[PDB]
Amino acid sequence: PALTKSQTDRLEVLLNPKDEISLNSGKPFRELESELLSRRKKDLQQIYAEERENYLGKLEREITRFFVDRGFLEIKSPILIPLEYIERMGIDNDTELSKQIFRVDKNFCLRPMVAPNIFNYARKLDRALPDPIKIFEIGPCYRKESDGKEHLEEFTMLNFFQMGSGCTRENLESIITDFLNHLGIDFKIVGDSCSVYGDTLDVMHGDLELSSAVVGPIPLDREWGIDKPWIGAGFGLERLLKVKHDFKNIKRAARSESYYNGISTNL
Ligand SMILES: Nc1ncnc2c1ncn2[C@@H]1O[C@H](COP(=O)(O)OP(=O)(O)NP(=O)(O)O)[C@@H](O)[C@H]1O
Numbered sequence: 001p002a003l004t005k006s007q008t009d010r011l012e013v014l015l016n017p018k019d020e021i022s023l024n025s026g027k028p029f030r031e032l033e034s035e036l037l038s039r040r041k042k043d044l045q046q047i048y049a050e051e052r053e054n055y056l057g058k059l060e061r062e063i064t065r066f067f068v069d070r071g072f073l074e075i076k077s078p079i080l081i082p083l084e085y086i087e088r089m090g091i092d093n094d095t096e097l098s099k100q101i102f103r104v105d106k107n108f109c110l111r112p113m114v115a116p117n118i119f120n121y122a123r124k125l126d127r128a129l130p131d132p133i134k135i136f137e138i139g140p141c142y143r144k145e146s147d148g149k150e151h152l153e154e155f156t157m158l159n160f161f162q163m164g165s166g167c168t169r170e171n172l173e174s175i176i177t178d179f180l181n182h183l184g185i186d187f188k189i190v191g192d193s194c195s196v197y198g199d200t201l202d203v204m205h206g207d208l209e210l211s212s213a214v215v216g217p218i219p220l221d222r223e224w225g226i227d228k229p230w231i232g233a234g235f236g237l238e239r240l241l242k243v244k245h246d247f248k249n250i251k252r253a254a255r256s257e258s259y260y261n262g263i264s265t266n267l
């Protein structure tokens, strides 16, 4: 007989993009499941025997090497930041994004973005380092979400930032272009609106936003003690993984107990 929706959901959990198994077949659920379980077990065994690296960790290392080689300083700043920093990004209690914030005490929250820390490092380092100032951070960010198709509550952001000389739209696009061609991820850059900062570039993979990027200066800068030209962009690592490995849902690329490198751990 026909597969139930529940059964199809179960098989899809075990389906990988690589597979070429037709669900319109002359075989019962039990055999389709057993076959997929066997394949997925073999996938994990191959990883265990050979590379043993997590995709999210490996991607971070690859991105890190890319930016370190291009002259960007690697930053590791607090994940737990003051709620005040979020107000200073121009996000009042009444506004929309403030509901998305995971608060910890009355004082602190889980960073929804690394910008505050990047701006602070830029300002401080400008007193020590030659122009231009080039920095990047990769790490966890957190936002309460209703969507679970392209949106995680716990995700990993790459943010790079340059300040001083060379901070042009052209150079921003070149870094982005070299970065994504290096990772082997297809994209197009479009100039669209996003009132978290102002006018932006959007880096799209079809209908999926990989990044929102900014060419400063912007009026917010003075709140962070920045008074120089700057360029910057943020990318979600899980989105890059989702695109690179052709995962149907972003949860397959996330920190998870249910998936390892996009392979179900519920076998
Ligand atoms: N909840 C999330 N899960 C995974 N990645 C995210 C999430 N939020 C933001 N990102 C990534 O961070 C990049 C820049 O963030 P930002 O532009 O500040 O948020 P945003 O534009 O509100 N994201 P979106 O909801 O896709 O429009 C995005 O282009 C994504 O690659």
Ligand SMILES: CC(=O)NCCCC[C@H](N)C(=O)O
Residues within 6 Å of the ligand: 112, 113, 114, 115, 116, 118, 141, 157, 158, 159, 160, 161, 231, 232, 233, 234, 235
């Ligand atoms: C690099 C820069 O200018 N600002 C950083 C903004 C960080 C956004 C954060 N990483 C996020 O989208 O979650």
